[PDB]
Design a protein around this nucleic acid. Structure first.
Lengths: 185, 260, 132
RNA sequence: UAUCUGGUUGAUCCUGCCAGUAGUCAUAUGCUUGUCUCAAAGAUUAAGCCAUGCAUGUCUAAGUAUAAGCAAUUUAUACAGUGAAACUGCGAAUGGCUCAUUAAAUCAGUUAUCGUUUAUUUGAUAGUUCCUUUACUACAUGGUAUAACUGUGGUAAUUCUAGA
RNA sequence: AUUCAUAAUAACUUUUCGAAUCGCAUGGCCUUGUGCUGGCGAUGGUUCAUUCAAAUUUCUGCCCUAUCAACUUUCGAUGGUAGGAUAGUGGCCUACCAUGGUUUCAACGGGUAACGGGGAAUAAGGGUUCGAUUCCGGAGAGGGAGCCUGAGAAACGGCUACCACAUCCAAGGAAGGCAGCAGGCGCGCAAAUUACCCAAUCCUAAUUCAGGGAGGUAGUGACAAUAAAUAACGAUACAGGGCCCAUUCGGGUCUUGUAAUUGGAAUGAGUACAAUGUAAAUACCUUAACGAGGAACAAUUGGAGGGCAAGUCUGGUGCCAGCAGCCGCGGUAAUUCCAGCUCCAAUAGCGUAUAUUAAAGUUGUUGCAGUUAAAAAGCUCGUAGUUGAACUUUGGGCCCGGUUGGCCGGUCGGAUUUCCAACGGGGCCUUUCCUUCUGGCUAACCUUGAGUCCUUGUGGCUCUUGGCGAACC
RNA sequence: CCGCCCGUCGCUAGUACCGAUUGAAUGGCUUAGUGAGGCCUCAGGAUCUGCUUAGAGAUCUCAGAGCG
């Protein structure tokens, strides 16, 4: 037998499942950004959790330490390239603060809506999950993504499928051919 | 378990062959050879993974079986032959020559060498005793015994070997003021000339070493192996020069300065 | 078909096998897949060695579409290609023909039967003939 | 992500459990079941029993091939193209499988063999044996067999084997 | 560190080795004969090292149990002598001699649903539980015991016998082992196909060209994970914010929701030409030709008294049937049962068991409690164990001197450069011992030749006729 | 206080323990007695095969005997 392909779960469930404060507040996010499940929210809060604990572990050691410097600069720069944390607070103490809202803002589901063109966030999600849109030459079909700052200006419709160009589609084929042209025998 | 182990899995083999976890269960066990199992590097590993010439084992065998390539300027047709530290891999592919020397991270880089350097190699003398009929002899790290040596050559010293002939062209004594490479373990693939030696009765002579930046350290003498005189190394060193940069200098040079 | 545009990236010359090895990258908007046979036809525009002498193998399409990556070889002469290339690729190229013989377990059964007979075994048959 | 909440009283505050709660590369089991990637899967009772088939064989320019084989040697009445079979030499002690026993035993880290065996690689390595090296037998290099084989059989039967 | 490597004598050998081996190209020579020499290898070949290892071995650590306090010493116990035996040391085993070795800092016995580690689960920190399982090591191939052969086995896809099961049969004998792959039976709460293939990654062979359920490739696969379709957009009729140019009485982008009223648009799931993929296929990734408007291509699984989020809605049942993890509901108006309406949770996934972790500061070293809630032993002695007063050189300086930050920013936010406060170091003197003594040193320069290319600065590049032995062994 | 609650007695279901059985089965350890099998040796020599004084007529068994 060969070595195992390693794995570990990304979502992390809450402790108290029925709570009035959490259920009401978390569902608003889901309604605004258009998240299908609570699992996605929990995933985002798990990544965020990992970042937080890492930052705490960096901060327990002294300043001007080899471990604290390097890791801090790379963590911070990772959080900058994705665009969650802006340029003003690049201090390592600020990454402890942060919030889930910023993370969901940085998802490609809503970055199409924040650009515009897709009207509603739900519509944008539909566009993404139905093979439309692209980061550059590379096509993307997944709502969750994290756009990497430089990628922002290159987001547009893909060459394949309409809006960008190419053929019309199925419904339009049926309207143009099976209905409109087929009237004349 | 009832005799020698012929098979060898991935994972059990050393980390410094850069063997990917997947794309196979097993690894090439190095054949019984000059060098040890864990330190050395198979020829297959040197071909398909490092140099990228061959893809499969098939291709490697087809390259080796037509002579062409040769360790120590000798046929060497077996697939998993242990090419270890400081060995000349002579190829007929556009007159290319290769020396196995350690890197910053304790690996075997594709370090090319001149046609003049291909003539000779080095070797750490491990013991010197009388053989039969009172004839003295030395033994290098790769088992290359040399009959009728110079009495100056004592244990722990280096010998320059001529390959074409089993002879001693030169010898270098073991002390400070010499360029001193270091193999084995934590400080593997570094150079710092020796500051001073330490005796310690009952084995293990920890030597003190001081690199060009004066970041001193200590290593065990068994893993220490010298090279040449101060500012005059008898072999051409690779990129890095046996210094070892910290992670800060790495993030300055290897992911900031080098970019377009 | 549109563009096509063959790009042989990561070129390594291999003197010890008498070939070159390279990464074939293709830009193919407005067509499904790349097709190896067409690339064999059109790779000779840059290298010039007929087709069977060259060879290629090894592809995969990029996500979405319009593009394909691949890994391939170009041998100089035909004989070299024949002797160095794996046997199965020759069948794909149409040079060699694999002898489609019995199943693996069937062959193993045959081997066992041969183990069970000592010597040539014509003696046993002759003994049976004398018996009846 | 350093958290609690209901249950004993007429109501209270406590000791103190009970139940709730989330996780599980810990399993089963119920219902439900569209996609992609990735994947452990007769361990637990039972190292309980097993039909049957398969899992270790092995060739180059280079040990032995008048196969009474094939296709022919076109350099071969010494073989000197290929080559089943057998002899020889290696391999079969690696692997893969399971965990029953086993508590200072295995085991980990850590020494040591100046208490030793070590096929094989790898590098070195015995010009002095006709001990009457004054005839001594050939050293232009000699003898003992014996498988495959041809043919005669034995037994109900097994990769049983007998003579010649 | 040696009776070591090694050498040289006196010896024995019942006899180790010193190629009677094989292939490619065929030459270079000589007073010229099937003459003398001749390259490139392959495989053998004794010893020595090397490699692969193997075997023993030092120390240190392991799960519960004193309703397991004495065990080991007979036919080995601990030690010594001498042998035998091993590749070897050694009670390993003989004959003799001695009386030891272990232990309540817990031996010896018993249990373990105990192979040991690397690890896994949980996590504030400390911990507790698991580790048959993909890597290392061990052990065994039904139970035991013995052995051939090889370098290597006490081998089991080698053998031998006895025990237990169990097969063919002419009864005369003959052949057995899956805890290898795939399966069949048993036991089960519990687990997959008698599939393809050496193309990979390796391994074995006299070996690039063979063989390998080693392994890899499909299938079965809700054990676990990752991503993630289950529908978006308008128009019309409603209760509205009211927005664009602010020519306040022009028409519709954004709309907050409710409306089987309606019009197009985009797709997948799925069918499949082709190609790719591959040992060869299946998938995936692609993509011609097709494939959404409702019983369409419909998503469930648990709940709705409290804990815990959501119902005092509608009918049946009437302490009955039942629900209920807990408290409690049901005796004829049930916000807990049975259904239906509507709602809530999680959402291609939820519920139910048993084990376990957290919460459990309900095991507590960190971190519990012991007046009355369970708990201080009747009291004292006392061995082990645990713990146990203070006191045995601080201060003062002298320099040398790195690290912090700002004027010095004379370089264009960095810092050429030092005063400045703080922070850690190194020497020396203060009665202060920082092991000593000797051959290379007369070295850290009282030896001084001209001492100068250094703002009237004891802050800093040079050098002759030569001096205080630890800066190294 | 008609409040709570303690036990002798009858009554359904279970639960361990004791145990008639000089139960029965299975395991480890062992007194005494017996002990296959290979392996090592003391012997044994069916048979095969060399040498030689020596048998037969000019690497010939025809007698045997010794040496192996």
């Amino acid at each position: 037998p060969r070595a195992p392909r390693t794995y570990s779960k990304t979502y992390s469930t809450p402790k108290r499942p029925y709570e009035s404060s959490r259920l009401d507040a978390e569902l608003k996010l889901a309604g605004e950004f258009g998240l299908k499940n609570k699992k996605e929210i929990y995933r985002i809060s798990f990544q965020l959790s990992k970042i937080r604990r890492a930052a705490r572990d960096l901060l327990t050691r002294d300043e001007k330490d080899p471990k604290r410097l390097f890791e801090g600069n790379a963590l911070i720069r990772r959080l900058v390239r994705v665009g969650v944390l802006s340029e003003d607070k690049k201090k390592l103490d600020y990454v402890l603060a942060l919030k889930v809202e910023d993370f969901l803002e940085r998802r490609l589901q809503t970055q199409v809506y924040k650009l515009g063109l897709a009207k509603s966030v739900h519509h944008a999600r539909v566009l993404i999950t139905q093979r439309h849109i692209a980061v550059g030459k590379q096509i993307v079909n997944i709502p969750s993504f994290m756009v990497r700052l430089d990628s922002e200006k290159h987001i547009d419709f893909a060459p394949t499928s309409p809006f960008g160009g190419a053929r019309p589609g199925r419904v339009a084929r049926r309207n143009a051919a099976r209905k409109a042209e087929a009237s004349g025998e | 378990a009832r005799g020698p182990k012929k098979h060898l899995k991935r994972l059990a083999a050393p980390h410094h062959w850069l063997l990917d976890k997947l794309s196979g269960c097993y690894a090439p066990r190095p054949s019984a050879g000059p060098h040890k199992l864990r330190e050395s590097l198979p020829l297959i590993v040197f071909l398909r993974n490092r140099l990228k010439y061959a893809l499969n084992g098939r291709e490697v065998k087809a390259i080796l079986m037509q002579r062409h390539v040769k360790v120590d300027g000798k046929v060497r047709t077996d697939t998993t032959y242990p090419a270890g530290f400081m060995d000349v891999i002579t190829l007929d592919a556009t007159n290319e020559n290769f020396r196995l020397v350690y890197d910053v991270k304790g690996r075997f880089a594709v370090h090319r060498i001149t046609d003049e350097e291909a003539s000779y190699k080095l070797g750490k003398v491990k013991k010197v005793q009388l053989g039969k009929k009172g004839v003295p002899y030395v033994v290098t790290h790769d088992g290359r015994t040399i009959r009728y040596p110079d009495p100056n050559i004592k244990v722990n010293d280096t010998v320059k070997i001529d390959l074409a002939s089993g002879k001693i062209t030169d010898f270098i004594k073991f002390d400070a003021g010499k360029l001193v490479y270091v193999t084995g373990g934590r400080n593997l693939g570094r150079i710092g000339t020796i500051v001073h030696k330490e005796r310690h009765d009952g084995g293990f002579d920890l030597v003190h070493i001081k690199d060009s930046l004066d970041n001193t350290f200590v290593t065990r003498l068994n893993n220490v192996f010298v090279i040449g005189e101060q500012g005059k190394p008898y072999i051409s060193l690779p990129k890095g020069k046996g210094i070892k940069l910290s992670i800060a200098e790495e993030r300055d040079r290897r992911r900031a300065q080098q970019g377009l | 078909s549109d563009a096509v545009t063959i790009r042989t990236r990561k070129v390594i010359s291999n003197p010890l096998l008498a070939r070159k090895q390279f990464v074939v990258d293709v830009l193919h908007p407005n067509r499904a897949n790349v097709s190896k046979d067409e690339l064999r036809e059109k790779l000779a525009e840059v290298y010039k060695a007929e087709k069977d002498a060259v060879s290629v193998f090894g592809f995969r399409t990029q996500f979405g579409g319009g593009k394909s990556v691949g890994f391939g070889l170009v041998y100089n002469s035909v004989a070299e290609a024949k002797k160095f290339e794996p046997t199965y690729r020759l069948v794909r190229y149409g040079l060699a023909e694999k002898v489609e013989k019995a199943s693996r377990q069937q062959r193993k059964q045959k081997k066992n039967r041969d183990k069970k007979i000592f010597g040539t075994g014509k003696r046993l048959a002759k003994k049976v003939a004398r018996r009846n």
